[PDB]
Design a binder for these strands. Sequence first.
DNA 1: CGGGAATTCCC
DNA 2: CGGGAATTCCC
Lengths: 313, 279
Amino acid sequence: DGPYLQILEQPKQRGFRFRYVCEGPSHGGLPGASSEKNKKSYPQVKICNYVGPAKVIVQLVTNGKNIHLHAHSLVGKHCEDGVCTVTAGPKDMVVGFANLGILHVTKKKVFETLEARMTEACIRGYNPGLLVHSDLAYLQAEGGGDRQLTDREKEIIRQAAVQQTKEMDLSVVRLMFTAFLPDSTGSFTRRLEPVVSDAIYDSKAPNASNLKIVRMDRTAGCVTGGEEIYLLCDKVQKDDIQIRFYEEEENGGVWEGFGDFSPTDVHRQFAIVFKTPKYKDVNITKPASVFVQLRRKSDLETSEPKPFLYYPE
Amino acid sequence: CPRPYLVITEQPKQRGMRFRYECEGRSAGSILGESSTEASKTQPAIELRDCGGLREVEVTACLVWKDWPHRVHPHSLVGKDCTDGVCRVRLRPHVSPRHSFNNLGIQCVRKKEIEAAIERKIQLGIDPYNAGSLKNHQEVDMNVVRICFQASYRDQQGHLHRMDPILSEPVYDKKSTNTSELRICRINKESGPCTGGEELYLLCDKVQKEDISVVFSTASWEGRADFSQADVHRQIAIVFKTPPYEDLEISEPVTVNVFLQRLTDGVCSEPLPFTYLPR
DNA sequence: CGGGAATTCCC
DNA sequence: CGGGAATTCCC
């Protein structure tokens, strides 16, 4: 009911490359679920119930039940150290994040990055038990920025920088927006409750990229199934992919069938040679208007439906 | 006047061998012979000629570049009696067929790894032809090396003799795509007319969209189907329109086997049975 | 081993 | 300123 942050347009979620360090960050800008063909739309948030000037920062937090710092790093203009700090609020309380880049540390150089991230955080506020170990907090900002601290603790983060690297999934990340209002002296120290964005999956992750049925062989087969068809497609994991044919019979249900193929019938992750399934009704003579779509058993992500035709005997 | 010498009585399978990185150690797939063929696996061998009178010879297999400047090659032959890029085997004729190097294997380095290794090589005194000291690195092919055999022997008094170096048929890496043996896994259909313009899918192995072609063969015939690079899906599935056959209207179909062929070095797959039909 | 995931390099 | 593909590392 008082001053609070809020996400306006969430990040896209799927279809963006976490360009590696060696690739050079200068590769693209993370969009918002909307950024369409001829109408971009970046991730923007608005401070609500407050109209004075502010400071809104963003960093990458892990995904899942726990919420810690991610080893990856945001990159861009007003960014640095994987945390972009845009200001905004003189009169307009909405702020967006254009040309946002997502690093991607090597599975190897993670720990060091974390340990360094955690510790450096063990000197300020919001970053204490919320981040590193929920058994500290004794930090939550003192008055001047205490020094490196003593051992044991200097070993508690290290021990946490470990348990965390182990469970960090570098193929997904969430943006964490944190607004800071000005508390006297004009300075920004009034830190509003943060807000996490949706998951953002690395399009270079075989397990979570967009699905696409790029031109396939036959656009129709006999209702007797067993029709062997060649399908060209974007990267898939033979063991977790499936070809779902389906029909939406008039408010009576929803038909669905799946093609046949051994994880061997998937060719180098881009082609799948399968046999079509028996339609819903075989004795019929009139051709069938059905839809086919690749699908991930894991996340249930589904490609665009391509029209398919079932013709009788 | 006869002088002892060695010869490659069997070159190493020019294509099909995959190179391994330090981080993979050894493997169950070693270097093969030109002949070979899954039924009669052969190994790359040599032989010593006019060597009687030589109680014992010593041969040393060690990769070297490939062209004119035959500097020691970065990678290294790994396997039996080796150690560094140099498989050694002492020999006494009264046999002399030179086994044929059985498990022999190549262990590639990393594009950065070069300079060092190649340098640590001469530093270690390994160079079948001697390179130089001023800059031993420019454009090196990590996909094509070449085995160089050598032999030497003593005589009455230690003084050893070195019988001229013998190069081998160029060996190519199976992963360097542009340098691997092409193959056709499956193929859309094998029926089809004779006119042409019949869309035929073709699931092949790794191949570059800007250097691949498929040609149907016949009696000294070679018609290649058309298709744009936009048809080659992620180098694993070439899709094409069927070409016409040497102007025919005959009702009796015939075998017009097809196959992948590289525009770069002409190399090509093993033909795949496909026959036309009438109009 | 050979297929793929992880990281690069290249246009 | 994206995307394809080559190089390495891993299972």
